[PDB]
Amino acid sequence: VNPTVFFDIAVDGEPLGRVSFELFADKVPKTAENFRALSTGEKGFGYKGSCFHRIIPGFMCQGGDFTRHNGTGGKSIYGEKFEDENFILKHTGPGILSMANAGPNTNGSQFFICTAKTEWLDGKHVVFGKVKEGMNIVEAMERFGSRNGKTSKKITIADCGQLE
Amino acid sequence: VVHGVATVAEKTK
DSSP, rough: OOOOEEEEEEEEEEEEEEEEEEEEETTTTHHHHHHHHHHTTTTTTTTTBBBBBBBTTEEEEEEEESSSSSSSOOSSSSSBBBOOOOOOOOSTTTEEEOOBSSTTTTOOOOOOESOOOOOOGTOOOOOOEEEEHHHHHHHHHHHOOOOSSSSSEEEEEEEEEEEE | OOOOOOOOOOOOH
């Protein structure tokens, strides 16, 4: 069964709400597994406490740098950036979860949650999940972004994990 | 060995 993970979002430390994701392990198991493991913290590092460093309303919310906490870091569970597993799934609309990268085969930990259809990213970024519940939290988050991407309040993953 | 910063680009206009 495709795994479910959650983020508990906070805004300058004030809880906003829980966002739940389906991870498409049936299509991109290696990419799903990375994100699942980073969400549970089981390897002794991961997303908890990290922030969404770049939010552009009408485009996406980007996060996942738990190593430098400045948008320049992140790391996979595989000891090295990992391969683009496939581009079977497309950026079809709001709620898609996709990997940020530095060009082909450079997947780490950074990701984005789309707030619109982003079809120009098809074939460049690996789509691996989708918001299941709490898209309205992502819409609320999105309001703290700006056209240039800097956030006006600190948007954090206060807790995260895998759901039964 | 130095690797690149993960990013995602806005649509080209």
